[PDB]
Design a protein around this motif. Structure first.
Motif, PDB file in Angstrom:
ATOM      1  N   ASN A  67       0.810  -1.231   0.000  1.00 61.50           N
ATOM      2  CA  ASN A  67       0.000   0.000   0.000  1.00 61.50           C
ATOM      3  C   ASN A  67       0.840   1.277   0.000  1.00 61.50           C
ATOM      4  OD1 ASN A  67      -2.400  -1.502   0.010  1.00 61.50           O
ATOM      5  ND2 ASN A  67      -2.653  -1.335   2.208  1.00 61.50           N
ATOM      6  N   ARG A  89       3.635   1.887  -1.236  1.00 59.93           N
ATOM      7  CA  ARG A  89       4.366   2.104  -2.494  1.00 59.93           C
ATOM      8  C   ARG A  89       3.417   2.334  -3.670  1.00 59.93           C
ATOM      9  NH1 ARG A  89       7.347  -3.175  -0.651  1.00 59.93           N
ATOM     10  NH2 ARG A  89       5.401  -3.936  -1.612  1.00 59.93           N
ATOM     11  N   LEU A  90       2.281   1.640  -3.660  1.00 53.55           N
ATOM     12  CA  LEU A  90       1.230   1.885  -4.657  1.00 53.55           C
ATOM     13  C   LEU A  90       0.736   3.335  -4.579  1.00 53.55           C
ATOM     14  CD1 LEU A  90      -0.482   0.862  -6.926  1.00 53.55           C
ATOM     15  CD2 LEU A  90      -2.178   0.127  -5.224  1.00 53.55           C
ATOM     16  N   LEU A 111       1.902  13.305 -12.786  1.00 53.23           N
ATOM     17  CA  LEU A 111       1.928  13.166 -14.248  1.00 53.23           C
ATOM     18  C   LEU A 111       0.734  13.854 -14.905  1.00 53.23           C
ATOM     19  CD1 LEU A 111       3.188   9.522 -14.579  1.00 53.23           C
ATOM     20  CD2 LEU A 111       4.406  11.621 -15.212  1.00 53.23           C
ATOM     21  N   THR A 112      -0.466  13.476 -14.473  1.00 53.93           N
ATOM     22  CA  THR A 112      -1.715  13.966 -15.089  1.00 53.93           C
ATOM     23  C   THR A 112      -1.892  15.484 -14.967  1.00 53.93           C
ATOM     24  OG1 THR A 112      -3.024  13.489 -13.098  1.00 53.93           O
ATOM     25  CG2 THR A 112      -2.938  11.765 -14.844  1.00 53.93           C
ATOM     26  N   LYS A 145       0.609  16.839 -17.455  1.00 53.36           N
ATOM     27  CA  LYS A 145       0.014  16.453 -18.745  1.00 53.36           C
ATOM     28  C   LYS A 145      -1.089  17.435 -19.158  1.00 53.36           C
ATOM     29  CE  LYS A 145      -2.371  12.687 -21.125  1.00 53.36           C
ATOM     30  NZ  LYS A 145      -3.566  13.480 -21.454  1.00 53.36           N
ATOM     31  N   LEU A 161       0.525  20.589 -20.122  1.00 58.39           N
ATOM     32  CA  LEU A 161       1.079  20.367 -21.466  1.00 58.39           C
ATOM     33  C   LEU A 161       0.023  20.596 -22.541  1.00 58.39           C
ATOM     34  CD1 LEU A 161       3.407  17.367 -20.773  1.00 58.39           C
ATOM     35  CD2 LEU A 161       4.073  19.674 -21.490  1.00 58.39           C
ATOM     36  N   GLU A 177      -0.798  24.294 -22.804  1.00 55.79           N
ATOM     37  CA  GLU A 177       0.236  25.164 -23.385  1.00 55.79           C
ATOM     38  C   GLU A 177       0.563  24.811 -24.842  1.00 55.79           C
ATOM     39  OE1 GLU A 177       4.153  25.489 -21.718  1.00 55.79           O
ATOM     40  OE2 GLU A 177       4.354  27.449 -22.746  1.00 55.79           O
ATOM     41  N   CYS A 178       0.489  23.523 -25.174  1.00 56.88           N
ATOM     42  CA  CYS A 178       0.723  23.063 -26.555  1.00 56.88           C
ATOM     43  C   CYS A 178      -0.315  23.660 -27.516  1.00 56.88           C
ATOM     44  CB  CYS A 178       0.693  21.533 -26.635  1.00 56.88           C
ATOM     45  SG  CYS A 178      -0.962  20.822 -26.337  1.00 56.88           S
ATOM     46  N   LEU A 231       0.207  27.616 -28.103  1.00 62.24           N
ATOM     47  CA  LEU A 231       1.278  27.817 -29.095  1.00 62.24           C
ATOM     48  C   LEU A 231       0.825  27.445 -30.510  1.00 62.24           C
ATOM     49  CD1 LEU A 231       4.233  26.342 -27.056  1.00 62.24           C
ATOM     50  CD2 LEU A 231       3.715  28.763 -27.472  1.00 62.24           C
ATOM     51  N   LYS A 232       0.153  26.301 -30.585  1.00 69.40           N
ATOM     52  CA  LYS A 232      -0.309  25.719 -31.855  1.00 69.40           C
ATOM     53  C   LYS A 232      -1.372  26.605 -32.519  1.00 69.40           C
ATOM     54  CE  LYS A 232      -0.387  20.845 -33.058  1.00 69.40           C
ATOM     55  NZ  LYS A 232      -0.259  19.572 -32.334  1.00 69.40           N
ATOM     56  N   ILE A 292       0.319  30.099 -33.827  1.00 68.36           N
ATOM     57  CA  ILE A 292       1.075  29.798 -35.058  1.00 68.36           C
ATOM     58  C   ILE A 292       0.113  29.636 -36.248  1.00 68.36           C
ATOM     59  CG2 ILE A 292       2.617  28.146 -36.208  1.00 68.36           C
ATOM     60  CD1 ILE A 292       3.790  27.482 -33.447  1.00 68.36           C
ATOM     61  N   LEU A 311      -1.483  32.861 -37.210  1.00 70.19           N
ATOM     62  CA  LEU A 311      -0.424  33.705 -37.773  1.00 70.19           C
ATOM     63  C   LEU A 311      -0.091  33.337 -39.222  1.00 70.19           C
ATOM     64  CD1 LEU A 311       1.526  35.995 -37.213  1.00 70.19           C
ATOM     65  CD2 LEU A 311       3.188  34.263 -36.461  1.00 70.19           C
ATOM     66  N   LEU A 362       0.700  -2.507  -9.142  1.00 71.88           N
ATOM     67  CA  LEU A 362       2.033  -1.933  -9.352  1.00 71.88           C
ATOM     68  C   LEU A 362       2.451  -2.178 -10.803  1.00 71.88           C
ATOM     69  CD1 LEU A 362       4.175  -0.383  -7.877  1.00 71.88           C
ATOM     70  CD2 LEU A 362       5.395  -2.554  -7.541  1.00 71.88           C
ATOM     71  N   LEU A 376       4.419  15.106 -26.043  1.00 71.17           N
ATOM     72  CA  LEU A 376       3.884  16.432 -25.694  1.00 71.17           C
ATOM     73  C   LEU A 376       4.984  17.456 -25.448  1.00 71.17           C
ATOM     74  CD1 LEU A 376       0.930  15.355 -23.410  1.00 71.17           C
ATOM     75  CD2 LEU A 376       1.020  15.837 -25.885  1.00 71.17           C
ATOM     76  N   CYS A 417       5.974  20.686 -28.131  1.00 74.58           N
ATOM     77  CA  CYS A 417       6.002  22.017 -27.500  1.00 74.58           C
ATOM     78  C   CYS A 417       7.374  22.692 -27.629  1.00 74.58           C
ATOM     79  CB  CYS A 417       5.605  21.917 -26.028  1.00 74.58           C
ATOM     80  SG  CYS A 417       6.766  20.921 -25.035  1.00 74.58           S
ATOM     81  N   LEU A 419       7.736  23.710 -31.188  1.00 74.92           N
ATOM     82  CA  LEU A 419       6.849  24.876 -31.302  1.00 74.92           C
ATOM     83  C   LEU A 419       7.560  26.160 -30.883  1.00 74.92           C
ATOM     84  CD1 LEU A 419       3.487  23.412 -30.029  1.00 74.92           C
ATOM     85  CD2 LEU A 419       4.224  23.836 -32.392  1.00 74.92           C
TER      86      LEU A 419
END
Lengths: 39, 39
Positions: free
Chosen positions: A3, A5-6, A16-17, A20, A23, A26-27, A30-31, A34, A37, B6, B23, B27, B30
Motif C-alpha cells: 500500500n 508504495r502503490l 503526471l496527469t 500532462k 502540457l 500550453e501546446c 502555441l499551436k 502559429i 499567424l 504496481l 507532448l 512544445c 513549437l
C-alpha cells in the motif's frame, strides 16, 4: 508495504496527469497562435 | 492484486510518460520554430 508504495505511484499518477494537463493546455496555445499567424 | 496494480501503474506510468515525451517534444519544436520564424 504494498500500500505504501502503490500510493507513491498514484500520487505520481496525479503528478503526471497535472503536468500532462498543463502540457495539453500550453501546446494548444502555441499551436493556435502559429496557425492563426500563418493565415 | 496490490502487486498487480504496481504492474498496472508502472506500465501506466510508462504510457503516460511516453505521451508526455510526445507532448514535451512538440512544445519544444513549437517554441523553437517560433524563434526561427521571428528571426
Amino acid at each position: 508495504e504494498m500500500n505504501e508504495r502503490l500510493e507513491d505511484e498514484e500520487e505520481m499518477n496525479a503528478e503526471l496527469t497535472a503536468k500532462k494537463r498543463k502540457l495539453e493546455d500550453e501546446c494548444s496555445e502555441l499551436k493556435r497562435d502559429i496557425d492563426d499567424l500563418e493565415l
